[PDB]
Amino acid sequence: LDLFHRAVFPFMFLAQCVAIMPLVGIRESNPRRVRFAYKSIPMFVTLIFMIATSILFLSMFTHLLKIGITAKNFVGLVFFGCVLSAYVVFIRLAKKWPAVVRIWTRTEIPFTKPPYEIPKRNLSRRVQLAALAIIGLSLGEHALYQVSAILSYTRRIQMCANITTVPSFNNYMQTNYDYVFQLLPYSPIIAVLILLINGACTFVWNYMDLFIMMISKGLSYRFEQITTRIRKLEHEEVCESVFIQIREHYVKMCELLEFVDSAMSSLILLSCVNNLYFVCYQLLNVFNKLRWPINYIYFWYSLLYLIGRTAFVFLTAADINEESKRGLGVLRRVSSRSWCVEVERLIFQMTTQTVALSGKKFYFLTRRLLFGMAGTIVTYELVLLQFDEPNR
């Protein structure tokens, strides 16, 4: 059936494979069989992944202490700490996830029955499209990163170095992927597993935004179903019972949104802060020159993908607010004689109450917030180009 759990679990399982949101029974179609247990195989795999990412973080910290902590090299520590924070926040989210899934299944039951109808693109297809787009873009970004790494390595070896170095996979690992073998003894297995850990770190960084997108789409699906139900009575006379049902379903959707926001406030805050910091860093670094054209294509692809992913997360989150507001226009056109207390309550609720995901209530994810964030980014970049100027 068209349920959020059945539409989200195919990618929740892949995140479990990348050790995110440790749970048992996440592959089962029954939403009541998923539970969080500290003694589980997914718990052990995510514990191993956390240990590996922490080893990466300590190696980066040691390297930066040896070299010197600046505003440029600190981005590695920020990225690794953000991955660790994502791991911890996802552990807590998986702890809270049984109740979240249960309430999501309970409140979404009436939305699978008439007069609500499935749109041209059901929740499964929407989540699949969003997740496939995000996964493909992240895989392409990592592919261009690796390709640029190998190519910069080869052009750094074949000329501009007077040779004196046999091109090998070992030297690749010890040079491009240094600062980790200084603490650990070298081994091809060790190097390949470090590669897998870095890939999983990038995948977790992308999956934070992917999970936010999927949750926002799941909420906007039901909100759009409610909006379509309201629209389907545009030129027809509506009884008080229909308005009572619409108001009750809207109230239940608001309750579910509040519960999901309380559960995901930490994840939303972490994702927003991380995305803002990395967008500012990349916009600061946009003006420098790169040694090879492949580096230019990779860097511009990465910057465009990061900006687009942040904007798409914000727009998908604001889709909830826009969908809740869209019913107001149709409700404002209700005929005079078919106007009752229920319609007044519903209109007051949509007009006055803000209905959107929030970063621990500090801000509400809306299109207004996206425009304000864009302006703040512009101002921060204008200020930081003063710092950037003496370098060039």
CB-CB contact of 152 with 292 (8 Å): yes
Does 202 carry a binding-site annotation?
A: yes
Contact region with a copy of itself (CB under 8 A), list: 152-160, 171-179, 224-232, 359-367: 359-367
21: left (phi > 0), else alpha (psi -120 to 50), else beta?
left
In angstroms, how far is the first alpha carbon of the chain from the final one? 59
- Closest to a copy of itself by CB, 145 vs 300, is 300
Place of tokens 């990348």: 18
Closest contact distance (angstroms) between CB of 18 and a copy of itself is: 32
Does 141 carry a binding-site annotation?
A: yes
- Classify residue 168 as exposed, middle or buried by CB count within 10 Å of its CB (0-12, 13-18, 19+): exposed
- Residues in 336-355 that interact with a copy of itself by CB under 8 A: 336, 339, 341-342, 345, 347-349, 351-353
CA 37 to centroid of chain Cα atoms: 25
Contact region with a copy of itself (CB under 8 A), list: 130-138, 167-175, 219-227, 380-388: 380-388
Residues near a copy of itself (CB under 8 A), total: 42
Structure tokens at 47: 């514990």
Residue 368 engages a copy of itself in binding (rule: CB under 8 A): yes
Tell me the per-residue interface mask from 316 to 335 with a copy of itself, x by CB under 8 A, - otherwise: ------x-----xx--xx--
Place of tokens 């805050």: 269
Residue 379 engages a copy of itself in binding (rule: CB under 8 A): yes
CB-CB contact of 376 with 329 (8 Å): no
Nearest residue to 225 via CA among 126, 112, 313 = 112
**Sign (positive or negative) of CA dihedral 153, 159, 165, 168:** positive
Tell me the per-residue interface mask from 235 to 254 with a copy of itself, x by CB under 8 A, - otherwise: ---------x--x---x--x
Residue 232 engages a copy of itself in binding (rule: CB under 8 A): no
- How many other CB atoms are found less than 10 A from the CB of residue 38? 9
Does 76 carry a binding-site annotation?
A: yes
- Classify residue 8 as exposed, middle or buried by CB count within 10 Å of its CB (0-12, 13-18, 19+): buried
- Residues in 148-207 that interact with a copy of itself by CB under 8 A: none
Residue 288 engages a copy of itself in binding (rule: CB under 8 A): no
Residue 370 engages a copy of itself in binding (rule: CB under 8 A): yes
Structure tokens at 46: 């995510």
Residue 380 engages a copy of itself in binding (rule: CB under 8 A): yes
Closest contact distance (angstroms) between CB of 251 and a copy of itself is: 5
Q: What is the Cα–Cα distance from 303 to 178, expressed in whole angstroms?
A: 24
**The only residue of 28, 117, 178, 255 in contact with a copy of itself, by rule CB under 8 A:** 255
CB-CB contact of 134 with 206 (8 Å): yes
- Residues in 63-92 that interact with a copy of itself by CB under 8 A: none
- Closest to a copy of itself by CB, 144 vs 318, is 318
Identity of the residue numbered 236: E
Nearest residue to 153 via CA among 292, 322, 58 = 292
Residue 362 engages a copy of itself in binding (rule: CB under 8 A): yes
Closest contact distance (angstroms) between CB of 390 and a copy of itself is: 9
Q: What is the Cα–Cα distance from 390 to 147, expressed in whole angstroms?
A: 32
Q: Could you tell me which residues are annotated as the binding site for sucrose?
A: 76, 141-142, 179, 202, 298
Query: What residue ranges bind a copy of itself (CB under 8 A)?
Result: 244, 247, 251, 254-255, 258, 322, 328-329, 332-333, 336, 339, 341-342, 345, 347-349, 351-353, 360-363, 367-368, 370-371, 375-376, 378-380, 382-387, 389
| Positions at the binding site for D-maltose | 141-142, 179, 198, 202, 298
